[PDB]
Amino acid sequence: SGFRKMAFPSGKVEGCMVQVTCGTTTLNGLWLDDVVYCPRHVICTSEDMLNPNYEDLLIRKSNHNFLVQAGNVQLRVIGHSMQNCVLKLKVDTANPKTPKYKFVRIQPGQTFSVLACYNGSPSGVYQCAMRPNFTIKGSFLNGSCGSVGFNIDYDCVSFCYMHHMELPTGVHAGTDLEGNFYGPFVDRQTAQAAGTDTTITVNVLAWLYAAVINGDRWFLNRFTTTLNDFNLVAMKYNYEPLTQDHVDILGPLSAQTGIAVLDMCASLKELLQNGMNGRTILGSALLEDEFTPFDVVRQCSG
Amino acid sequence: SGFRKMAFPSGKVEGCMVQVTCGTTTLNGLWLDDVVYCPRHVICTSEDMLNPNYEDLLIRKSNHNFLVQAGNVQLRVIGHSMQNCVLKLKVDTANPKTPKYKFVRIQPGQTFSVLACYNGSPSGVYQCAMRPNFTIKGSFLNGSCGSVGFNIDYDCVSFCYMHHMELPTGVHAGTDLEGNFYGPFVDRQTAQAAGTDTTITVNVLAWLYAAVINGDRWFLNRFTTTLNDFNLVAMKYNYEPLTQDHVDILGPLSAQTGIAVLDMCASLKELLQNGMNGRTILGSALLEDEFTPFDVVRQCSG
Numbered sequence: 001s002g003f004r005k006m007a008f009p010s011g012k013v014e015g016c017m018v019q020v021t022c023g024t025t026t027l028n029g030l031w032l033d034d035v036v037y038c039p040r041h042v043i044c045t046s047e048d049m050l051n052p053n054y055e056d057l058l059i060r061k062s063n064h065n066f067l068v069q070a071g072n073v074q075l076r077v078i079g080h081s082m083q084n085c086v087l088k089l090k091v092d093t094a095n096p097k098t099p100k101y102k103f104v105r106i107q108p109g110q111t112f113s114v115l116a117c118y119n120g121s122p123s124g125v126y127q128c129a130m131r132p133n134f135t136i137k138g139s140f141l142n143g144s145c146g147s148v149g150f151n152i153d154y155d156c157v158s159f160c161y162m163h164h165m166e167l168p169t170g171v172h173a174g175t176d177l178e179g180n181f182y183g184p185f186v187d188r189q190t191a192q193a194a195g196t197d198t199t200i201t202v203n204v205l206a207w208l209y210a211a212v213i214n215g216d217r218w219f220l221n222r223f224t225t226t227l228n229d230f231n232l233v234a235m236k237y238n239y240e241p242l243t244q245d246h247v248d249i250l251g252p253l254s255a256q257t258g259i260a261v262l263d264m265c266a267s268l269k270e271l272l273q274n275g276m277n278g279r280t281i282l283g284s285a286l287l288e289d290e291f292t293p294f295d296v297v298r299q300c301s302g
Numbered sequence: 303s304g305f306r307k308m309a310f311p312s313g314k315v316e317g318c319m320v321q322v323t324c325g326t327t328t329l330n331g332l333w334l335d336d337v338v339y340c341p342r343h344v345i346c347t348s349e350d351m352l353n354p355n356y357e358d359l360l361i362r363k364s365n366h367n368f369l370v371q372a373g374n375v376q377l378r379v380i381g382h383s384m385q386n387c388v389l390k391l392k393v394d395t396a397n398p399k400t401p402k403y404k405f406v407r408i409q410p411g412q413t414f415s416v417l418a419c420y421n422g423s424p425s426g427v428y429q430c431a432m433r434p435n436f437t438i439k440g441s442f443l444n445g446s447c448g449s450v451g452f453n454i455d456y457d458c459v460s461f462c463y464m465h466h467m468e469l470p471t472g473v474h475a476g477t478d479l480e481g482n483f484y485g486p487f488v489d490r491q492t493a494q495a496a497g498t499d500t501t502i503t504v505n506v507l508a509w510l511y512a513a514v515i516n517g518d519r520w521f522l523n524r525f526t527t528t529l530n531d532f533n534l535v536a537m538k539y540n541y542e543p544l545t546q547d548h549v550d551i552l553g554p555l556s557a558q559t560g561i562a563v564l565d566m567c568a569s570l571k572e573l574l575q576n577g578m579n580g581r582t583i584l585g586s587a588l589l590e591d592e593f594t595p596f597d598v599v600r601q602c603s604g
């Protein structure tokens with residue numbers, strides 16, 4: 001029993017974290033086989049950051065300009081390139097701790113584990129969702145850029161996020177591991193605003209099913225609703241529209257609990273319209289949207 | 303910026319997790335050097351569980367009765383003993399992945415990271431506090447017994463919890479790594495009730511300081527209170543008494559934010575008496591008590 005924000009075990013990613021230094025700029029890199037991946041803005045000075053031309057800055061770099069440290073052993077760089085917003089440094093040593101891995105670009109509403117690192121050294125692990133506005137609400141300090149987000153499936157690490165910057169609002173933006181930003185953001189030190197955010201409806205419903213599986217039932221009701229009438233209430237409360245695909249994804253949880261998806265939507269509708277009136281769900285006094293249906297199935301009983 | 307429930311990187315503990323089997327009973331064990339540690343009730347059958355005499359059951363065991371698997375390699379047991387409620391199995395191979403480590407018995411209100419494991423294989427990591435009633439509100443399914451809780455300080459793993467059982471209320475009980483239960487519990491399959499729980503006051507205050515550090519200030523006020531008058535309100539809301547030692551521990555956070563501890567207590571008093579009135583603190587609509595002052599300092603900016 002019980003339900004917790006749960007990260008993947010981080011060991012396989014810990015063995016890949018390194019430190020990349022260019023002059024006075026140091027951030028984290030990811031060492032897989034003989035390649036180190038890190039944010040390309042490591043080649044920027046504090047002056048270059050307002051509006052860099054990265055093609056210019058990179059062509060002016062030498063391999064010996066890059067200081068790569070794994071633990072306390074320096075890795076010699078033998079080649080460098082740029083793929084979108086990530087720098088790729090070829091090193092002369094393949095990482096002996098390289099896990100089985102994939103790079104994947106995720107959709108908003110999907111979750112991943114973040115290994116927050118400083119100077120190539122892991123400090124903590126936590127669970128994040130990609131917000132509908134392509135930011136993440138992370139916990140990051142100066143020096144954390146280059147930390148990665150990931151999922152694990154049967155000892156294969158699927159890397160999906162590399163951290164690039166904190167916005168003026170204190171939320172966080174970055175790329176997939178091929179250097180493409182999530183959202184409209186760019187890697188320059190200017191004030192960038194994210195789009196207006198929305199609540200991840202399919203995830204809230206997943207989490208209501210988690211609660212039922214764990215014995216919370218006080219919010220259920222005898223009513224049901226149609227998809228259309230539910231979405232009318234969803235739009236009013238800044239919730240993402242619920243699609244038929246979302247309904248089908250919630251199939252397994254619906255079947256395990258015996259509660260039709262549209263039955264659960266009537267509960268959510270009532271919770272949005274009336275609040276909780278002091279009660280809690282899975283220890284929360286608000287509706288939680290950073291658990292996917294997959295997260296719930298993974299953590300909850302069969 | 304940002305504030306998340308944050309676990310320690312779990313890699314060093316992942317390399318120690320094994321599987322221990324006695325007949326039809328399998329749980330998780332911890333392999334450090336040439337010793338495997340696991341709950342002693344692995345030597346119980348489903349019948350023995352109502353009221354075992356463990357001295358009896360253990361003296362009837364042979365080394366070859368214990369099946370210990372690390373990954374897919376079987377470890378041969380060469381000796382066994384019992385220390386309180388933990389079984390100790392000497393194996394012929396020292397764990398090459400053994401980290402620097404300590405065993406520590408923690409106080410209620412302290413937090414630790416849990417590596418939830420099934421059949422010797424890690425599945426997830428999350429943060430827990432030891433409740434004042436010596437339970438933890440974990441996330442555990444059948445097969446998780448033997449999973450450990452831990453803190454990490456400069457590459458030393460301080461193991462503090464081994465999981466032994468879920469109570470009828472769905473909360474969780476276990477021991478330190480020398481086999482002493484936290485709280486009054488015993489390892490037999492009977493319905494055991496925990497004492498009435500209380501909220502960890504010093505931790506709530508730490509978390510209010512985290513919020514200030516992160517820019518949440520709406521709950522502050524110009525008032526202050528004495529320790530005695532605060533504790534009068536604390537008792538009324540089932541909060542632990544705040545001690546002078548708690549005040550002194552909150553010193554660093556108080557100094558960083560410029561907010562006297564007893565100033566912050568006046569905010570907590572007002573929050574207890576009036577609620578939040580729909581507002582949130584660090585994304586929470588209730589007062590959070592599973593972050594210690596140390597957790598806040600570790601995660602927040604200087």
Ligand SMILES: N#Cc1ccccc1C[C@@H](N)C(=O)N[C@H](Cc1ccc(Cl)cc1Cl)C(=O)N[C@H](CC(=O)NCCCc1cccnc1)Cc1ccc(F)cc1
Pocket residue numbers: 041049140141142143144145164165166167168169170172186187188189190191192303516517
């Ligand atoms: N994580 C992280 C992090 C956090 C703090 C310091 C450092 C780092 C890592 C570090 N690497 C990095 O992100 N630095 C970028 C600057 C930057 C570097 C490189 C690139 Cl490519 C792009 C950018 Cl924008 C950075 O300083 N952002 C600040 C961070 C900041 O002051 N928050 C205060 C929010 C306060 C707040 C809280 C709650 C509600 N409301 C407001 C915001 C900002 C300001 C002016 C800009 F014009 C652009 C961005």
Ligand SMILES: N#Cc1ccccc1C[C@@H](N)C(=O)N[C@H](Cc1ccc(Cl)cc1Cl)C(=O)N[C@H](CC(=O)NCCCc1cccnc1)Cc1ccc(F)cc1
Pocket residue numbers: 001214215343351442443444445446447466467468469470471472474488489490491492493494
């Ligand atoms: N984690 C975990 C876990 C969870 C589920 C299954 C298995 C395990 C691991 C496993 N190893 C283990 O804990 N099994 C013990 C039995 C046991 C084994 C060994 C020892 Cl030494 C002591 C005990 Cl008590 C176990 O089944 N407990 C159940 C678990 C249970 O039904 N919860 C339902 C709660 C429902 C609920 C939810 C919310 C609010 N209200 C109620 C509760 C219980 C029942 C009768 C007893 F008489 C004693 C304990």
Ligand SMILES: [Cl-]
Pocket residue numbers: 062063064
């Ligand atoms: Cl060169």
Ligand SMILES: [Cl-]
Pocket residue numbers: 084085
């Ligand atoms: Cl680009």
Ligand SMILES: [Cl-]
Pocket residue numbers: 364365366
């Ligand atoms: Cl023997």
Ligand SMILES: [Cl-]
Pocket residue numbers: 386387
């Ligand atoms: Cl005992």
Ligand code: NA
Pocket residue numbers: 005006007125126127307308309427428429
């Ligand atoms: Na977590």
Ligand code: NA
Pocket residue numbers: 005006007125126127307308309427428429
């Ligand atoms: Na966590």
